[PDB]
């Protein structure tokens, strides 16, 4: 009863590394967006929508592992 | 006189012989060892000009020079098979780093006073981020206080320990084994390699120490 | 400014000078830049490729012979070209193919000429691609 | 031994140093030796030509 | 391609790129201007006191 | 521990070495520099 | 051969010397305290 | 039955590392896509479907890791 | 009891390693921002809001990791 | 074999860390695809099959990791 | 109590790794700073404060990791 | 053979991670291949065998890791 | 008590992992400094001081890791 | 001696992580080789042998770990 | 004197893990040095010293890791 | 003494990781040298010893890690 909860906590802790890639990826998408806007001021109206779409996509990718950790903790 | 005392007196004797005894009659020719000393002086003086120059580099050049020669003579006696790393405590380098950081802070508080606290805010970082900036820079300076010692001392001790462990683990080099061919002589090759590595590392880290203390002195005297 | 002005000039007869224009393809060494309007100032070496120029009339293809795709903050697109591709009247398969195969034998003649014959055949193959 | 193999390798290290680094440093020092001697003699020659 | 090391410079590269189209031109587009461009009669005649004036080689 | 044999002694050592260096050896290099400058000028 | 030239040793290098003195005093004070022996 | 369940939890937690590479790959694909779109505005038609395909293939690994974690847990 | 707290602390430790991604990501965001504003000075006003928004989202992911570590601890 | 089964589970969880490489790798391949098509449009057809083959070869590592994980499990 | 303090030490050791990415982050921001400044000297005055803020709080993320390690210890 | 087989499984799982490096090798080799062939179509004919040999040699390391893991399982 | 010192040593070992980030950070800082001097040799005098500053910050992160390990030991 | 062999197998499993460096090493070596031959075909005859030697040295570094793991297997 | 020595060796390994960053760091420093002298042959005498500086600093970081390992060995 | 030797083997196995950095480093140096010599062929004579030294130092770090593993094994 104690061991299973302990391993649940361990699994949540090792799952928390899943958001590392999500953060790095969201930020690299934003970085490429900024570079593209700087190298082409008139392309903002085009780059902004798919930039936000990729942000949300990577955020959902990270939130998958975040929810896995949450269900490991409280389930 | 302990081991450290005799090591230091021998170091002082050899270092003073390298200058006052190199000159047979102190001619103007500037012989090969004389020209080597001249090159070292010129190099340290242009560290000073490049990294702390602009009003008062010359005043602070001599400590750079003396620390460079002390570290040079310490690193030169590091690879001799008997050579002991100055009693093998290396806390001396930590003490040097601490005293140099303390002197730099005293100089900053003397020539600037309360303005030294403005060094934590170089260009921007307004009030919402001011405490974070000052904490970060204070911790960076605290790390700088230990950077110099835990650097040269660490590398010297690590080199000596690698030396000892390598020599210990190849004690069967041609004692009893039958496979002592060039494959068994490869450990001698790695020992030779670490000889060269320790020499180059000692020299380049003496240069590292010189440039680091020059940069610290510039940061102390000049606020940016 | 509204829109984009393009300054297309040729040694025989200049084509465009300060004329309102939308997106124009500018094939460079890396790739073509579809400058819509304004745009950051740039300097890119143009490579033989299709320069497609949109106006309100139609979409006319102009296979360029080279130049520079240089822009200014005042949105001045001065493309200093040499030879253009007026509509498709310049298209001719046979002369391009025979010139390519005839410059292949002299593609290794003498140093500079040998190296430049390969580039001439490359731009001839680009002409073949533009032939449609 | 725990330390004698280091003594054995010290000779090889000194040999390699004398083979590679020593000639380079010798040439580097002698080049500026000749440079200093020549520039000093040239300055003296210029001074004596001016006085002549 | 290699118009700098194997080749000569950008000038000859661009000139030959234009000349490829100029020679491979339709008869309707073949007018006096393109014919004048195609014709090349400049001879490299270097100076005497500058480059010994060896011979008037083609440009 | 065995600290009152090398730390304060080491401080006296680098103090006297700094004094000897700055008062003796740097002046020789300065003197040769200024002499070469003078007889070169 | 060898002569004494009076370069500034205290007018300019006082902070380092006073820091060394303070470090030595702190070491002497902590020798009987920060040794755990 | 307890220690094996504990190992199940630990292994399922470790198996979720795949989201690292999945997300970083999706994002760098989108970064190249946005860089090409900005530098070459006339590439969208031929770059969008292939960007979508690359994103799907990159997310294949992430969904596989999610599925294996789920089956290890259940 | 004590083993549960022990694994709680170890999970907090292996959750603190989530901030490495936030740091590297905000690094790349501000790096591209600096490169872009250095390219053309006129674009800084337009690119600052998007850059700071992406930074804030990366810091939000890092704060999510820190909050998971804290709810582990506390 | 209870602890053996627990170690099987933990080993499968550890071995599931191979899909990071396949994912980010095929994504790097797709990013190079995007850069190439943005640069040269005429080379898209030529780079289609080679890049798809490279994607398959990169995902072969993830397939091998999946096989190892399944062998550890089943 | 032995295991509690033991895993507190383990979690503190794992937690302080946050300085890895803090250093990498300040370094990446600084690298782009150097690239942009050398490519555009005139942008120094308006790039310097933003970069300072950026790497300062990027290191503050590592400081947060250090604080987590400290509370794990103390 | 409880602990021995358990550690064999753990070691195989830890050995399975060489495929990530193998995949990165194949991937960046193919990415450079795509960039080169897009930059100049003529160089593609020469580079393609180079890419074949490069990815084969890179996959050799992954095969070595797979064999090391396999001998730990049977 | 023996397990407490054992975990002290383990946490001290783990505390040193974050130092590799400091090393690669100072290294990429000096790499960008090399590239900047290559592009603009004349800006070297202005650029070197805050290059030393960036090295100091990354080495400070490494030294926080080192001091955490040291206090974990003694 | 059961735990001795168990941890020997564990060390052999973790000793294969050094192959990761060989993999990404051949990766970057061949990537730069392809980029360089894309720059100009002339430099191939002089750049290929050093690329081969670099791959050989990288695979030797990997084989060092492979041999150490084999020593931890037999 | 059994678990303490065991965790001492384990922590020595977890500390020697950090020399990877120092190696890649001296590598990237020398790499940018090569690229800089490549773009301009004439800047070699200026870019050599700070490059060997960065190499020395990264090697000293690696030897910090080695020192942390060595106090866990002697 | 079983646990002591067991952890010696574990420590050596995990200490062997430094060859990852060694290989990545030597190959980074080789890649940069390849790029430099391809960009300009003339500089090869002045850039070859540079890359040789960089490779030597990186493989020296790798040898340091290998020797740490060896001393954990046999010492």
From Swiss-Prot, chains A, P:
Keywords: CF(0), Formylation, Hydrogen ion transport, Ion transport, Lipid-binding, Membrane, Mitochondrion, Transmembrane, Transmembrane helix, Transport. It is a multi-pass membrane protein. CDD domains: ATP-synt_Fo_c_ATP5G3. Gene3D superfamilies: F1F0 ATP synthase subunit C. The keyword Transmembrane applies. The record marks 59 as: Reversibly protonated during proton transport. One of its GO terms (biological process) is proton motive force-driven ATP synthesis. The chain crosses the membrane at residues 14-34, 52-72. GO terms for molecular function: identical protein binding; lipid binding; proton transmembrane transporter activity. PROSITE patterns: ATPASE_C (PS00605). Mitochondrial membrane ATP synthase (F(1)F(0) ATP synthase or Complex V) produces ATP from ADP in the presence of a proton gradient across the membrane which is generated by electron transport complexes of the respiratory chain. F-type ATPases consist of two structural domains, F(1) - containing the extramembraneous catalytic core and F(0) - containing the membrane proton channel, linked together by a central stalk and a peripheral stalk. During catalysis, ATP synthesis in the catalytic domain of F(1) is coupled via a rotary mechanism of the central stalk subunits to proton translocation. Belongs to the ATPase C chain family. This is ATP synthase subunit 9, mitochondrial. It comes from Saccharomyces cerevisiae (strain ATCC 204508 / S288c) (Baker's yeast).
Curated annotation (Swiss-Prot), chain B:
GO terms for cellular component: mitochondrial inner membrane; mitochondrion; proton-transporting ATP synthase complex. One of its GO terms (biological process) is proton motive force-driven ATP synthesis. It holds the Pfam family ATP-synt_A. It is a multi-pass membrane protein. It is found in: Mitochondrion inner membrane. Keywords: ATP synthesis, CF(0), Hydrogen ion transport, Ion transport, Membrane, Mitochondrion, Mitochondrion inner membrane, Transmembrane, Transmembrane helix, Transport. CDD domains: ATP-synt_Fo_a_6. One of its GO terms (molecular function) is proton transmembrane transporter activity. The chain crosses the membrane at residues 1-21, 57-77, 90-110, 115-135, 156-176, 181-201. PROSITE patterns: ATPASE_A. It comes from the Eukaryota. Its main location: mitochondrion. Changing residue 142 to I: In strain: D273-10B/A1. F-type ATPases have 2 components, CF(1) - the catalytic core - and CF(0) - the membrane proton channel. In yeast, the dimeric form of ATP synthase consists of 17 polypeptides: alpha, beta, gamma, delta, epsilon, 4 (B), 5 (OSCP), 6 (A), 8, 9 (C), d, E (Tim11), f, g, h, i/j and k. NCBIfam families: ATP_synt_6_or_A. Belongs to the ATPase A chain family. This is ATP synthase subunit a. It comes from Saccharomyces cerevisiae (strain ATCC 204508 / S288c) (Baker's yeast).
From Swiss-Prot, chain D:
Belongs to the eukaryotic ATPase B chain family. It comes from Saccharomyces cerevisiae (strain ATCC 204508 / S288c) (Baker's yeast). It is found in: Mitochondrion; Mitochondrion inner membrane. F-type ATPases have 2 components, CF(1) - the catalytic core - and CF(0) - the membrane proton channel. In yeast, the dimeric form of ATP synthase consists of 17 polypeptides: alpha, beta, gamma, delta, epsilon, 4 (B), 5 (OSCP), 6 (A), 8, 9 (C), d, E (Tim11), f, g, h, i/j and k. This is ATP synthase subunit 4, mitochondrial. Present with 12900 molecules/cell in log phase SD medium. Mitochondrial membrane ATP synthase (F(1)F(0) ATP synthase or Complex V) produces ATP from ADP in the presence of a proton gradient across the membrane which is generated by electron transport complexes of the respiratory chain. F-type ATPases consist of two structural domains, F(1) - containing the extramembraneous catalytic core, and F(0) - containing the membrane proton channel, linked together by a central stalk and a peripheral stalk. During catalysis, ATP synthesis in the catalytic domain of F(1) is coupled via a rotary mechanism of the central stalk subunits to proton translocation. The chain holds residues 88 to 139 of 244 of the full protein.
Swiss-Prot record, chain F:
Keywords: ATP synthesis, CF(0), Hydrogen ion transport, Ion transport, Membrane, Mitochondrion, Transmembrane, Transmembrane helix, Transport. One of its GO terms (molecular function) is proton transmembrane transporter activity. It comes from the Eukaryota. It is a single-pass membrane protein. InterPro entries: ATP_synth_su8_fun (IPR009230). GO terms for cellular component: mitochondrial inner membrane; mitochondrion; proton-transporting ATP synthase complex. The chain crosses the membrane at residues 7-26. It is found in: Mitochondrion membrane. One of its GO terms (biological process) is proton motive force-driven ATP synthesis. F-type ATPases have 2 components, CF(1) - the catalytic core - and CF(0) - the membrane proton channel. In yeast, the dimeric form of ATP synthase consists of 17 polypeptides: alpha, beta, gamma, delta, epsilon, 4 (B), 5 (OSCP), 6 (A), 8, 9 (C), d, E (Tim11), f, g, h, i/j and k. Belongs to the ATPase protein 8 family. This is ATP synthase protein 8. It comes from Saccharomyces cerevisiae (strain ATCC 204508 / S288c) (Baker's yeast). The gene is ATP8.
């Amino acid at each position: 009863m104690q061991l299973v909860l302990a391993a649940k906590y361990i699994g949540a802790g090792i799952s928390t590394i899943g958001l590392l890639g999500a953060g790095i990826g969201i930020a690299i998408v934003f970085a490429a967006l900024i570079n593209g806007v700087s190298r082409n001021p008139s392309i903002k109206d085009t780059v902004f929508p798919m930039a936000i779409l990729g942000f949300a996509l990577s955020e959902a990718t990270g939130l998958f592992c975040l929810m896995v950790s949450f269900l490991l903790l409280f389930g | 006189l302990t081991t450290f005392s005799l090591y230091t007196i021998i170091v002082l004797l050899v270092i003073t012989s390298l200058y006052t005894l190199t000159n047979n009659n102190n001619k103007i020719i500037g012989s090969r060892w004389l020209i080597s000393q001249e090159a070292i002086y010129d190099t340290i003086m242009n560290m000073t000009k490049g990294q702390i120059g602009g009003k008062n580099w010359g005043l602070y050049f001599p400590m750079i020079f003396t620390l460079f020669m002390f570290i040079f003579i310490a690193n030169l006696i590091s690879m001799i098979p008997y050579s002991f790393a100055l009693s093998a405590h290396l806390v001396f380098i930590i003490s040097l780093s601490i005293v140099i950081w303390l002197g730099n802070t005293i100089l900053g508080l003397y020539k600037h006073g309360w303005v030294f606290f403005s060094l934590f805010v170089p260009a921007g970082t307004p009030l919402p981020l001011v405490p974070l900036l000052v904490i970060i820079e204070t911790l960076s300076y605290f790390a700088r206080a230990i950077s110099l010692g835990l650097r040269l001392g660490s590398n010297i001790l690590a080199g000596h320990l690698l030396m000892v462990i390598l020599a210990g683990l190849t004690f069967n080099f041609m004692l009893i084994n039958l496979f002592t061919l060039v494959f068994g002589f490869v450990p001698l090759a790695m020992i030779l390699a670490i000889m060269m590595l320790e020499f180059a590392i000692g020299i380049i880290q003496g240069y590292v120490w010189a440039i680091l203390t020059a940069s610290y002195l510039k940061d102390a005297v000049y606020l940016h | 400014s509204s829109g984009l002005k393009l300054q297309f000039a040729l040694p025989h007869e200049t084509l465009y000078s300060g004329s309102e224009v939308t997106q124009v393809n500018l094939p460079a060494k890396s790739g073509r830049i579809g400058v819509l309007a304004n745009h950051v100032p740039t300097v890119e070496q143009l490579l033989p490729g299709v320069v497609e120029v949109m106006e309100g009339s139609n979409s006319k293809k102009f296979f360029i012979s080279g130049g520079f795709a240089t822009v200014q903050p005042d949105s001045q697109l001065c493309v200093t070209a040499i030879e253009a591709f007026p509509l498709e009247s310049f298209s001719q398969e046979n002369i391009k193919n025979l010139l390519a195969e005839a410059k292949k034998n002299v593609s290794s003649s003498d140093a500079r000429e040998a190296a430049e014959a390969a580039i001439q055949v490359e731009v001839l193959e680009n002409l073949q691609s533009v032939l449609k | 031994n725990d330390e004698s193999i280091l003594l054995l390798t010290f000779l090889g290290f000194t040999g390699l140093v004398a083979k590679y680094l020593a000639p380079a440093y010798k040439d580097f020092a002698d080049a500026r030796m000749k440079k200093v001697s020549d520039v000093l003699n040239a300055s003296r020659n210029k001074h004596v030509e001016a006085v002549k | 391609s290699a118009w700098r090391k194997a080749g000569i410079s950008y000038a000859a590269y661009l000139n030959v790129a234009a000349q490829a189209i100029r020679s491979s031109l339709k008869t309707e587009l073949q007018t006096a201007s393109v014919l004048n461009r195609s014709q090349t009669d400049a001879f490299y005649t270097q100076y005497k006191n500058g480059t010994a004036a060896s011979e008037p080689t083609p440009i | 521990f065995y600290f009152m044999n090398q730390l304060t002694y080491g401080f006296l050592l680098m103090i006297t070495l700094l004094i000897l260096f700055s008062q003796f050896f740097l002046p020789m290099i300065l003197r040769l520099y200024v002499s070469r400058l003078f007889i070169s000028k | 051969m060898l002569k004494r030239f009076p370069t500034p040793i205290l007018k300019v290098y006082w902070p380092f010397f006073v820091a060394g003195a303070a470090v030595y005093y702190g070491m002497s004070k902590a020798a009987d305290l920060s040794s755990n022996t």
